[PDB]
């Protein structure tokens, strides 16, 4: 009887939302429907372009029901407030969406409540002003959840999907596969944070006050994550956006999507996560995430930068290129805070910087660099990452690099952190080594025959090559 | 140094309406003054305009209905950071 999507997000061990409010920007809604009656408040804010009745409020009713419906909702308690920014044909404007986001902020200033979650079940093309407004509303302290987009495309070309500091959510089906319908389907790429059930989701139907329908979209998928976020913030009201995003990642089912569905270049950039509620078991724990930069472009002096959240520490830095035309990476300070910067080679099409960003309170971290000598440095407390960069065109707590290269070591003073180094080499397009259960991958690098790059995939270190050896640094309390 | 931007997906564009975005620290009193300035310099040239909304709270700025002809003029107003042409968003 339990709908598949609700079972899918139930943790392997288990036992909300009332202190949290969830704003919805959608079509009008049938707020008398028994799934949501007494739970959604229509603001009657409205800003929609003109058209070019049970169909006018179908989309929004279903989503209100997915977040909060009493039979089929994710966070069955939660209060919702609803703004109308989509017309009867499902269309709206950037301008109107801007004024909605401004309206939610003005209401909060006028009558403050608790944590606020804003669901944005819409997209258009990349928009500078819409992305800036989301970023700004995020820095004021509001959590934004956004659809990845439905065009089987790189999500970074759409808004608010690509916006910084928004949680962007793609859709999977009952087989944990990316939704695909012809040349349509869930967007993907490095601007997607995670996936959630988004195919055949039963929810409130505006056909009658007690009816139910199955809809599919990335909106349905973002609605599961908004509801999960609301219950997470009801239990730990004080979470920062870094701390909430690190938990959504940690409690996701992992390596369950079949990456074959994605175009080849996007498998490395797309997180293999399907969202899930946190269990009953939850003690401090070391959370880390991997952050891929924008591609650097092909200018000869190009660099890509990868940054962490202000309350995260950069514990390691690596880089990747599809051609292997690459001059490595290095950690550099910036506004008093370390970032991860990768360098293109002359003639390469560009590189990615790949940061490992962790929540490590009480941590004093530094960088130890040795210019070319082979080359070595060490932490004279715990080594969390090794990086290396060179300026030539071609060839213990200790990092070791090529003789012609600079070698950089990330050293952190963390009382209560235990760390260990695990190795694995073989004769091979890809070589792999993983941290033991209960440890966190903090750094991933290849030993110095020609490598494309290295990246942390969850707790596995992946090295990509054209005796190649992968090196993982793993830490716990 | 002010720049202009519009949707790369040509069917999703909505020409004739523009979000004028002003520099971060600009105050609501300045935003409203820059709008009336735009309207006045446009009318001097024979263009009707319509200020649909004045943003303050997240981004300062305003929403104007006007012909695209004025974009080189509007780009030169004080406090302007950049200007973006309105476009469509869709239920996902």
């Amino acid at each position: 009887s339990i709908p598949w999507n609700l079972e899918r997000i139930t943790p392997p061990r288990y036992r909300g939302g009332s202190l949290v409010e969830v704003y919805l920007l959608d079509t009008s809604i049938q707020s008398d429907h028994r799934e949501i009656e007494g739970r959604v408040m229509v603001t009657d804010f409205e800003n929609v372009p003109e058209e070019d009745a049970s169909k006018c409020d179908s989309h929004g009713t279903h989503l209100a029901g997915v977040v909060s419906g009493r039979d089929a909702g994710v966070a069955k308690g939660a209060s919702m407030r609803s703004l109308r920014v989509l017309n009867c044909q499902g269309k709206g404007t950037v301008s109107g969406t801007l004024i909605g986001l401004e309206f939610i902020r003005k209401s909060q200033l006028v009558q403050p409540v608790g944590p606020l979650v804003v669901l944005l079940p819409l997209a258009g093309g990349y928009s500078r002003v819409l992305n800036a407004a989301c970023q700004r509303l995020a820095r004021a302290g509001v959590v934004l959840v956004t659809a990845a987009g439905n065009f089987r495309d790189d999500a970074c070309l759409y808004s608010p999907a690509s916006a910084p500091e928004v949680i962007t959510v793609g859709a999977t089906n009952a087989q944990d596969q990316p939704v695909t319908l012809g040349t349509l389907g869930t967007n993907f790429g490095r601007c997607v944070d995670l996936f959630a059930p988004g195919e055949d989701i039963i929810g409130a139907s505006s056909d009658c006050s007690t009816c139910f329908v199955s809809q599919s979209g990335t909106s349905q998928a973002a609605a599961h994550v908004a509801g999960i976020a609301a219950m997470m913030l009801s239990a730990e009201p004080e979470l920062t956006l870094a701390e909430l995003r690190q938990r959504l990642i940690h409690f996701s089912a992992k390596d369950v999507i079949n990456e074959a569905w994605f175009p080849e270049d996007q498998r490395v950039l797309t997180p293999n996560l399907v969202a899930a509620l946190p269990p009953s078991t939850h003690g401090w724990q070391l959370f880390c995430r991997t952050v891929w930069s924008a591609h650097s472009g092909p200018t000869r002096m190009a660099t890509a930068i990868a940054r962490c959240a202000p309350d995260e520490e950069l514990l390691s830095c690596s880089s990747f290129s599809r051609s292997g035309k690459r001059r490595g990476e290095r950690m550099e300070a910036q506004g008093g805070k370390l970032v991860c910067r990768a360098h293109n080679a002359f003639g390469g099409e560009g590189v990615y910087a790949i940061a490992r960003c962790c929540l490590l309170p009480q941590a004093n971290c530094s960088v130890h660099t040795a210019p070319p000598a082979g080359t070595r440095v060490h932490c004279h407390h715990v080594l969390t990452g090794c990086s290396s960069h060179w300026e030539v065109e071609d060839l213990p707590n200790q990092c070791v690099g090529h003789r012609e290269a600079s070698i950089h070591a990330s050293c952190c003073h963390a009382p209560g952190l235990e760390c260990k180094v695990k190795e694995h080499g073989i004769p091979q397009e890809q070589v792999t080594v993983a941290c033991e259960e209960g440890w966190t991958l903090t750094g991933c690098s290849a030993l110095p025959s020609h490598v494309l790059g290295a990246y942390a995939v969850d707790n596995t270190c992946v090295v990509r090559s054209r005796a190649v050896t992968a090196v993982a640094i793993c830490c716990r309390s | 140094t002010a720049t202009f931007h519009r949707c790369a997906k040509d069917p999703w564009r909505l020409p004739g309406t523009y979000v004028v975005v002003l520099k971060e620290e600009t105050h609501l009193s300045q935003s409203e003054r820059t709008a009336r300035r735009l309207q006045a310099q446009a009318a001097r040239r024979g263009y009707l305009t319509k200020i649909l909304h004045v943003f303050h709270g997240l981004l300062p700025g305003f929403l104007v209905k006007m012909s695209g002809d004025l974009l080189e003029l509007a780009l030169k107003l004080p406090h302007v950071d950049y200007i973006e042409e309105d476009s469509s968003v869709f239920a996902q």
């Binding site: 169909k55 179908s58 439905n150 | -």
Partner: peptide, 9 residues
């Protein structure tokens, strides 16, 4: 898949 969701029939 319903037409209320863009870009489905």
């Amino acid at each position: 898949f319903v037409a209320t969701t863009f870009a489905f029939x």
